[PDB]
Amino acid sequence: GNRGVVYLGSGKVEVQKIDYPKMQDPRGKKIEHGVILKVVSTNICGSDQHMVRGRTTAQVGLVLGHEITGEVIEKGRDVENLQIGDLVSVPFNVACGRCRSCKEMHTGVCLTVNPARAGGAYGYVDMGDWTGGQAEYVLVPYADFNLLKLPDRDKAMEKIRDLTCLSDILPTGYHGAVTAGVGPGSTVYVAGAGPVGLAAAASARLLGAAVVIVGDLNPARLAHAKAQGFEIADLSLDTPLHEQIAALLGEPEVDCAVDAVGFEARGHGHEGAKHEAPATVLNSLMQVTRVAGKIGIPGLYVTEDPGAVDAAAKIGSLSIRFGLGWAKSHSFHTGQTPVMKYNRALMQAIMWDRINIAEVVGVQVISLDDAPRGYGEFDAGVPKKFVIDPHKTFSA
Amino acid sequence: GNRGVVYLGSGKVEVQKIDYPKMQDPRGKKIEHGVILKVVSTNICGSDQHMVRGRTTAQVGLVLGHEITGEVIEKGRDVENLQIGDLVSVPFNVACGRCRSCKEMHTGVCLTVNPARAGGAYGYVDMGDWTGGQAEYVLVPYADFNLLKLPDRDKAMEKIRDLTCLSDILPTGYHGAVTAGVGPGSTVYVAGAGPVGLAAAASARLLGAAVVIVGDLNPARLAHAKAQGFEIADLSLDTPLHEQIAALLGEPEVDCAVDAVGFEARGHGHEGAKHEAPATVLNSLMQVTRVAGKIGIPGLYVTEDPGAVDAAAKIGSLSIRFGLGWAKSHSFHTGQTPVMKYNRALMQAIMWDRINIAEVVGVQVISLDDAPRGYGEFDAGVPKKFVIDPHKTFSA
Amino acid sequence: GNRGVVYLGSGKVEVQKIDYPKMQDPRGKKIEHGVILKVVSTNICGSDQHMVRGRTTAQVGLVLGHEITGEVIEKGRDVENLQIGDLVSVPFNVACGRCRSCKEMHTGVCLTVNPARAGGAYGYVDMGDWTGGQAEYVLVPYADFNLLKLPDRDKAMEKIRDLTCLSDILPTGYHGAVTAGVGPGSTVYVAGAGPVGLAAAASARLLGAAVVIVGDLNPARLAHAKAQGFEIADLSLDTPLHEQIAALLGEPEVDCAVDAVGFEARGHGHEGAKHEAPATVLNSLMQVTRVAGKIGIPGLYVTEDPGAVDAAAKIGSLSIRFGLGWAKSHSFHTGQTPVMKYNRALMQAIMWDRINIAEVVGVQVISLDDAPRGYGEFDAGVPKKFVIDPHKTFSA
Amino acid sequence: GNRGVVYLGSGKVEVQKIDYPKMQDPRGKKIEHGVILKVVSTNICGSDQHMVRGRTTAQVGLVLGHEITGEVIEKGRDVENLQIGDLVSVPFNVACGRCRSCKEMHTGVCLTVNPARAGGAYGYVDMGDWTGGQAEYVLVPYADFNLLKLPDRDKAMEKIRDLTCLSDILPTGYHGAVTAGVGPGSTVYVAGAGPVGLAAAASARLLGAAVVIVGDLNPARLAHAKAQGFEIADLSLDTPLHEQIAALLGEPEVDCAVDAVGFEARGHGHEGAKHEAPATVLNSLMQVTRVAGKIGIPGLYVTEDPGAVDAAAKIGSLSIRFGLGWAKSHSFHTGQTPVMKYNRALMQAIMWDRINIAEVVGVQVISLDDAPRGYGEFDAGVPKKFVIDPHKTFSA
Ligand SMILES: NC(=O)c1ccc[n+]([C@@H]2O[C@H](COP(=O)([O-])OP(=O)(O)OC[C@H]3O[C@@H](n4cnc5c(N)ncnc54)[C@H](O)[C@@H]3O)[C@@H](O)[C@H]2O)c1
Ligand SMILES: NC(=O)c1ccc[n+]([C@@H]2O[C@H](COP(=O)([O-])OP(=O)(O)OC[C@H]3O[C@@H](n4cnc5c(N)ncnc54)[C@H](O)[C@@H]3O)[C@@H](O)[C@H]2O)c1
Ligand SMILES: NC(=O)c1ccc[n+]([C@@H]2O[C@H](COP(=O)([O-])OP(=O)(O)OC[C@H]3O[C@@H](n4cnc5c(N)ncnc54)[C@H](O)[C@@H]3O)[C@@H](O)[C@H]2O)c1
Ligand SMILES: NC(=O)c1ccc[n+]([C@@H]2O[C@H](COP(=O)([O-])OP(=O)(O)OC[C@H]3O[C@@H](n4cnc5c(N)ncnc54)[C@H](O)[C@@H]3O)[C@@H](O)[C@H]2O)c1
Ligand SMILES: [Zn+2]
Ligand SMILES: [Zn+2]
Ligand SMILES: [Zn+2]
Ligand SMILES: [Zn+2]
Ligand SMILES: [Zn+2]
Ligand SMILES: [Zn+2]
Ligand SMILES: [Zn+2]
Ligand SMILES: [Zn+2]
């Protein structure tokens, strides 16, 4: 059998028995290029929280999870590179490797796996209805294209809390930093101290950044970031962000900025911080990024948000002070991360002890039975990254 | 003496006697690195029209003009590369060549020539108060860094209507196309059929584009674009832009898109087209650019527009459907063109007859006395690029 | 049945009855991801001439041909994107789409299709033993990754002489130009006026180059290059190449250079040009490329050349004046073209009439029975690109 | 007065009284855009050792030194950005900031400071005859373009052993790594464990490399590289380099390779390593770099080497196995480092404690009187980077 985390509506999730995976696409067409995995580790993301909070078009009954690490237990006949028993990291993007986007390495926007729009992902709104992987077992299509084979079992399993971050958050923070132009000696501001913002800060550090400033309103997440060796900015203070940056750096701007918040952003200041203001991060990043800088935006912005602040925000239309970014010659880089572009190199960085990602993001391993409470604690703001071990493969 | 085009407020300009240029900066500090030019050709830009329409903070008394081609008649002692008599193209950006931005080739955002913000330009709001060049004579500072020496007099003067476009519009259209990722075989949509949109289309063609579609509401400019060999889209029709693109290409999207309109954009449709809606072009480009595409934005967006449609638009804040561009993984590239990055190669393209820019943009040479009427005709929408010859150097 | 061109050693080729293609790799392992094509057009390359001249370790009995355009007449069970009857362009590289090289777009060096080294190709020495396609029928593996679907039958077949260049020579010329940094306004020197050098020149022109100088010692090919609109340099003259360039450009260097000759290069000068001197082109490109320039090298250099001038050259070791290139800060870009990187955009350039590649390279369509005489005429230096139409599909 | 290190021919150098610097170029033409520095730190380079060994056309009497850090004590009338007392890092390249190369950031090949060829440098053969700076005082031309202002006196002087590496070796190591494609998770091989190879290794580590293998035949330098945290390969062993790499990585190739040796390279193996063989490193890097990799070559190769192994090598012509590199699709990146491209970011990496460059390269501070013994110890292979403090400014 199988069981997984199901969205029930009204901010609730629950573990339920679900169908065992089949070798077919979501439209029921049998495939020979996929594998069925026994899930080793499967995480909870901020994107899942957006869905569970009712800020997307997600429907009741949705099986969640797009951050999978697992063992191949079955394979189709068009799977040349994986053997039964192999341990693999699964990119959250469902990609075919047989379309223009995939061939050009734009694996976040594959043209064939989703009938409604480009781009596919597991257990995710508007992403092709590929079943989620916060579960015991899951299907991965186009296995020879998507999967990253991990090192022999023993090496890999010792670092499983780090390697479970390769499915999404480490490559996502990395993509945010790279597309914001971070490199050796850069000064960087990362808005957001959730797991993706922390991964972006760790990635900026791995890239050689001179200093990373991580901003948030949540004081537990700021304390965590500071303890991990980053500088911080507290957006709930009345002190403007540019003054908090100037106090740390000697100038009110950074070389590079990353938005790791997205469409549920809060305003700034004692009062501002209390209310949602979806364009706040974009507007602040134009203010604090130096001229000709690049703004990397891994934070999610959607086409429909039923709980947004106004009619315009309900269809993703925000009041952005674009003239400011224009006057400073800023570039803006957005979208789902093409995880496959970076996951192999990041695996090598983890295996050679060049990054301590599980420590930086606050990995906490929980059972599948503890997933609903993990969602609740994460929603409350704890500075953790919940990693489910469904079969008690490594946390007995 | 000297005379130039002076902004008088209330949509009026007039030629007036102005001071002869001095070898000093706008703060009165003497400089040895500049030259004084006798102006050979000096054009009128859409940016000037924004100022003359009262859509910026420009003050009465402003001498206009930032598109200069001229002859060196005086030089300071820190000018090693120019000789009296040399014919030069002047980039519209005032850049020092002695700051981080300039050294990194971000010459549109020089850090030292403007006390108020990065970036300088002649006769332009918020750009360092460097005197404009729609005039008989003008100072160019940091001459060894900024100026592009043109071919020996005779060769260059035969193509002066083409070469006068190197100060701004050809490099600007080019920057729009390059930053939108145009190359050999690309399909391109250019919003705007004014001189910059036409230069972007010509630049896309020079870059090897398979096809360029130029959109506008002005039927004279669309007829011009069509006669120049481009495809067109008429935004005043009720037929949606994506359907007009699909009728030409077989799909409702292009590979690359350029915004050559900016902050006075009109809405689309029979009724829409009649009223201003500043976020219209940005929103439409996210709709018609394919996933993972790049949107190049040479069109001007400002920090303050006194005549905007609403309070938010008066400080450059627009209602942009950013969630759409995010869902499609779009990148956005903005700002003043770094003219020096591209003007030498574009000069070679002009001299070797690889681009016919004066024909494409509708160059029309006028006297300095005819500048106010040139402004009026340009404002009315004629499909021309007005080029003043102040001393009757080549149009007797 | 099937027939194809077979290499017989001692400079001879002959059309022979060969086996009908099978759905298997070169080792006999069955594959269900390939297609069998009915060959529509299939060309003869300069690489085939190196093999036929005995300048490689190609073995007697080799079926030649790696420039195929064809119609899908049989597909494996796991092919998702091709239908029977589709017309397709086949990149000359045999690539899997399932390894690190392919995922990173380095499809000229696929890691799994060739047991001996990275990189695969049809009918080619050290390329994995994939059967050549100067034949009636041919297998293409991993069809959903390699094949480029051509437009609706009719439009496509009208331009088949141009579209047949997409399998190799147009993307190759293009790769040489792009990796040499060619763009709008560039000055370019292309060494070699065979079909690949002519395609490099046409590609440089499509990229916007101001002027392309094509060098060769073969008068017919130089006259052809002139007729097609390029400048020329005749290496059989005693006039040094840099003087020839200076007479055309006013300076003895170009911005970009492309080696479209490879390891059978001749020396320069009246006497020099009569004798092989394999480092001649590499050495000359360092002399005529401007400082900080890039030298794109599509011309083939091999690890073993049994007929080379000396012991070192038989092992691919050449006396290259590297200190000159180093002193000028040159970069060198080499290898088999990754055809899939550029073929789709180049297809759109052909279909929209932006490049007349068949005319530029001198396409001459012939039957399969005329292939051996075509090889002979090509070996003698005719300025033609031989395109075989094996079933007389379009050349009746 | 002034004193500096003078090359006397026959492998000797001596400190002599030399002229005080003058505000003029090497031709005697007065300039008002330069500064005269009081030298704070000034290092000895492997390039100086090539000259002192008689392996270049350097002439007897040359004042050596191109690695200067100093205090502005006199400025020309046209210097805008430096004040008396400023502490500055001097890039080793003499660049004008006013030519095509400088504007495009190719400051290693400036077109105007050297009459004989592009590119200038202090105290260096074929570099324009700009006076060397292993001395008490030195002129720097075009000060507003070349100089990098260091942080407030106190912070800066505490880290002077690290900051003295910004003039050449840290940016050089960095350039070699970046142009070899090094980034987060890369595997890297650096040929050469002198100060530049050690700086390349430190730069690769700062860029995020998973592991760096440093090769040399000199045991002291290998032991140093190990102590500093890198992996090593000993080329004096009979064990082939690819086997040494395979023992460390599990595969006989690296993602990226850097040649930090240049034209006095030794062969490999117990016997081989005792003899000069100048193409050894180039040939070995093609063997150990993975397909489609990039080979960064900061190691010097010259147009004339009077002491080379053979006639061809005396003219910079080497028997390089180019067919191997071609077969593997390698690119080769060469030339003098454009120090200004990277020095400011590397300064911030030093100031924020992200790189411990002085420790890694083995900085040993000495007096000007000890320079000749420093040259001798360095020539004998000590694992040190000699930094002269001519006025005992920080090393009392
Ligand atoms: N692009 C991709 O591929 C991708 C992949 C993963 C997650 N995401 C998106 O990344 C974003 C972050 O994910 P997460 O897991 O870290 O989510 P999260 O909800 O745990 O973290 C967001 C953080 O932003 C903070 N925040 C709110 N307003 C702020 C403001 N004005 N300034 C600074 N911080 C502010 C919150 O307090 C919170 O700590 C989400 O939008 C998620 O959907 C994108
Ligand atoms: N970035 C730079 O360096 C730079 C340089 C030059 C000019 N500019 C800016 O470029 C823009 C164009 O300059 P120009 O000289 O061509 O100006 P212009 O005013 O002559 O042309 C703008 C055109 O846009 C059209 N337009 C309005 N709404 C439209 C819509 N929704 N879709 C399509 N077209 C629409 C107008 O009808 C008009 O023809 C201006 O904003 C100008 O300030 C920028
Ligand atoms: N990298 C790739 O993917 C790739 C693809 C196709 C072909 N190739 C190689 O491209 C090269 C050109 O292919 P082709 O079909 O045009 O070959 P070709 O043999 O028909 O043309 C080579 C031309 O070089 C000329 N030549 C010889 N010495 C010269 C010199 N010193 N200077 C200038 N010209 C000189 C010859 O006279 C000849 O016309 C060959 O080496 C071929 O193997 C590489
Ligand atoms: N491109 C630039 O801007 C630039 C700047 C500085 C120095 N350089 C050049 O960089 C090179 C290194 O400079 P350095 O100061 O470290 O010099 P160095 O002479 O102190 O070091 C070179 C090292 O290479 C070793 N070596 C010799 N043969 C070898 C082989 N086959 N494999 C590995 N190691 C081998 C030597 O034993 C020596 O330790 C020199 O050629 C120098 O001229 C270039
Ligand atoms: Zn996620
Ligand atoms: Zn796909
Ligand atoms: Zn303008
Ligand atoms: Zn500047
Ligand atoms: Zn070929
Ligand atoms: Zn492959
Ligand atoms: Zn040096
Ligand atoms: Zn220069």
Residue pair B178/B207 in contact by the 8 Å Cβ criterion:
yes
CA of A261 to the centre of ligand 1 (A): 3
Domains of chain D: 1-169+337-396 (3.90.180.10), 170-336 (3.40.50.720)
Question: If phi over 0 gives left and psi between -120 and 50 gives alpha, with beta otherwise, what is residue C353?
Answer: left
Name the token pair of A180.
């914001």
For B109, the closest chain A residue by CA position comes to A291
**Residues with C-beta less than 6 Å from any ligand 1 atom:** A 45-47, 49-50, 168, 172, 191-197, 215-218, 221, 235, 260-262, 265-266, 268, 280-281, 298-300, 336-337
In chain A, the N- to C-terminal Cα span, in Å, equals: 21
| Calpha distance B78→B80 (Å, rounded) | 6
To probe the interface with A, which of C77, C82, C144 has the most A CB atoms within 10 Å? C144
Strand partners, B95: none
Cβ neighbours, 10 Å, residue B145? 23
Look up residue C131 and give its DSSP letter. Answer: P
| Calpha distance D254→D252 (Å, rounded) | 7
For D81, the closest chain B residue by CA position comes to B98
For B187, the closest chain C residue by CA position comes to C348
- Closest by CA position to D146, among listed D320, D341, D330: D341
Strands (E), chain B: 2-9, 12-18, 35-43, 68-75, 87-89, 137-140, 148-149, 187-191, 211-216, 231-234, 256-259, 294-297, 318-320, 331-334, 363-366, 385-388
Of A185, A208, A352, the CB nearest to D210: A352
Residue B51 — φ and ψ, nearest 5°? -65, -50
* Elucidation method: X-ray
Element containing residue D179 per DSSP (H, E):
helix D169-179
Cβ neighbours, 10 Å, residue A242? 17
| Calpha distance C55→C301 (Å, rounded) | 11
Cβ neighbours, 10 Å, residue B93? 28
Q: What is the DSSP pairing of strand A12-18 with strand A87-89? A: unpaired
Q: Is the CB of B235 under 6 A from ligand 2?
A: yes
- Closest by CA position to D42, among listed D122, D107, D96: D122
| Calpha distance C293→C274 (Å, rounded) | 30
Q: In which order are the strands placed within the sheet that holds B231-234?
A: A231-234, A211-216, A187-191, A256-259, A294-297, A331-334, B331-334, B294-297, B256-259, B187-191, B211-216, B231-234
CA atoms within 13 Å, Cβ hemisphere of A366: 22
Q: Which residues of A are annotated as a binding site for Zn(2+)?
A: 45, 66, 96, 99, 102, 110, 168
Residue pair C277/C265 in contact by the 8 Å Cβ criterion:
yes
Interface contacts (A, C; CB < 8 Å): 40
Report how many helices (DSSP H) and strands (DSSP E) chain C contains, helices first: 15, 16
Residue pair C361/C195 in contact by the 8 Å Cβ criterion:
yes
AA identity, residue D327: A
Name the token pair of C153.
């039958």
Name the token pair of A5.
């985390």
Q: Please, where are the H alpha helices in A68-181? A: 100-103, 143-146, 153-158, 160-163, 169-179
Question: If phi over 0 gives left and psi between -120 and 50 gives alpha, with beta otherwise, what is residue D52?
Answer: alpha
Residue A372 — φ and ψ, nearest 5°? -60, -40
Residue pair C92/D302 in contact by the 8 Å Cβ criterion:
no
Shortest-distance Cα residue to atom 38 of ligand 1: A194
CA atoms within 13 Å, Cβ hemisphere of B117: 19
**Residues of A at the D interface (Cβ-Cβ below 8 Å)?**
174, 183-187, 203, 206-211, 344-349, 351-352, 354
Name the token pair of B281.
């072009």
CA of B299 to the centre of ligand 8 (A): 23
Residue pair C3/C372 in contact by the 8 Å Cβ criterion:
no
Look up residue D118 and give its DSSP letter. Answer: S
Torsion of CA D58, D60, D66, D67, to 10 degrees: 120
Please report all neighbours of D, defined by 3+ CB atom pairs within 8 A: A, B, C
AA identity, residue D361: V
Q: Is the CB of D45 under 6 A from ligand 4?
A: yes
| Calpha distance B315→B304 (Å, rounded) | 4
Residue pair C349/C355 in contact by the 8 Å Cβ criterion:
yes
What sign does the dihedral B87-B91-B95-B100 (CA atoms) show? negative
What sign does the dihedral B192-B193-B194-B195 (CA atoms) show? positive
Q: Which residues of A are annotated as a binding site?
A: 45-47, 50, 66, 96, 99, 102, 110, 168, 196, 216, 221, 261, 266, 268, 298, 300, 335, 337
For C351, the closest chain B residue by CA position comes to B210
CA of A116 to the centre of ligand 6 (A): 14
Mutate to test the pocket of ligand 4, among D232, D270, D300 (most ligand atoms within 8 A of CB): D300
Name the token pair of A147.
């999967």
In chain C, the N- to C-terminal Cα span, in Å, equals: 22
Strand partners, B366: B388
Torsion of CA C55, C56, C62, C65, to 10 degrees: -80
To probe the interface with C, which of B166, B354, B356, B357 has the most C CB atoms within 10 Å? B354
Name the token pair of C249.
């450009």
| Calpha distance A40→A389 (Å, rounded) | 6
| Calpha distance D178→D199 (Å, rounded) | 12
Q: What share of chain B is helix, strand, coil (3-state, %, to 5)?
A: 30, 25, 45
Residue by residue, DSSP assigns C46-106 as: HHHHHHHTT-S-PPTTPBP---EEEEEEEE-TT--S--TT-EEE--SB---SSSHHHHTT-
**Computed over its alpha carbons, how large is the radius of gyration of chain A?**
20
Residue by residue, DSSP assigns B144-200 as: HHH-EEPS-HHHHHHTHHHHGGGGTHHHHHHHHHHHTT--TT-EEEEE--SHHHHHH
Task: Looking at the CA of residue B267, tell me the nearest atom of ligand 2.
Answer: 31
**Residues with C-beta less than 6 Å from any ligand 3 atom:** C 45-47, 49-50, 168, 172, 191-197, 215-218, 221, 235, 260-262, 265-266, 268, 280-281, 298-300, 336-337
Element containing residue A319 per DSSP (H, E):
strand A318-320
Element containing residue C364 per DSSP (H, E):
strand C363-366
Name the token pair of C216.
């060769």
Would the CB atoms of C349 and B185 count as touching at under 8 Å? yes
Cβ neighbours, 10 Å, residue C212? 30
Residue by residue, DSSP assigns A243-260 as: HHHHHHHSSS-BSEEEE-
Would the CB atoms of D208 and A209 count as touching at under 8 Å? no
- B249 in a known ligand binding site: no
Name the token pair of B128.
């360092």
Helix axes D280-288, D241-249, angle to 10 degrees: 40
Which of chain A's residues have a Cβ under 8 Å away from the Cβ of B114? none
In chain B, the N- to C-terminal Cα span, in Å, equals: 21
Task: Looking at the CA of residue A193, tell me the nearest atom of ligand 1.
Answer: 39
Dmax (CA) for chain B in angstroms is 61
- C106 in a known ligand binding site: no
**Residues of D at the B interface (Cβ-Cβ below 8 Å)?**
32-33, 77-78, 80-81, 96-100, 103-105, 112, 144-145, 340, 344
For A184, the closest chain D residue by CA position comes to D207
Would the CB atoms of D103 and B77 count as touching at under 8 Å? no
Residue pair B87/B164 in contact by the 8 Å Cβ criterion:
no
- Closest by CA position to A279, among listed A293, A260, A265, A289: A265
Residue by residue, DSSP assigns B27-84 as: TS-B-SS-EEEEEEEEE--HHHHHHHTT-S-PPTTPBP---EEEEEEEE-TT--S--T
Mutate to test the pocket of ligand 3, among C90, C216, C384 (most ligand atoms within 8 A of CB): C216
Task: Looking at the CA of residue D281, tell me the nearest atom of ligand 4.
Answer: 31
- Closest by CA position to B217, among listed B185, B254, B250, B261: B261
Task: Specify the residue for token string 């020396």.
Answer: C267
To probe the interface with D, which of C100, C112, C291 has the most D CB atoms within 10 Å? C291
Residue pair A61/A19 in contact by the 8 Å Cβ criterion:
no
- B261 in a known ligand binding site: yes
User: 3-class SS at D71?
Assistant: strand
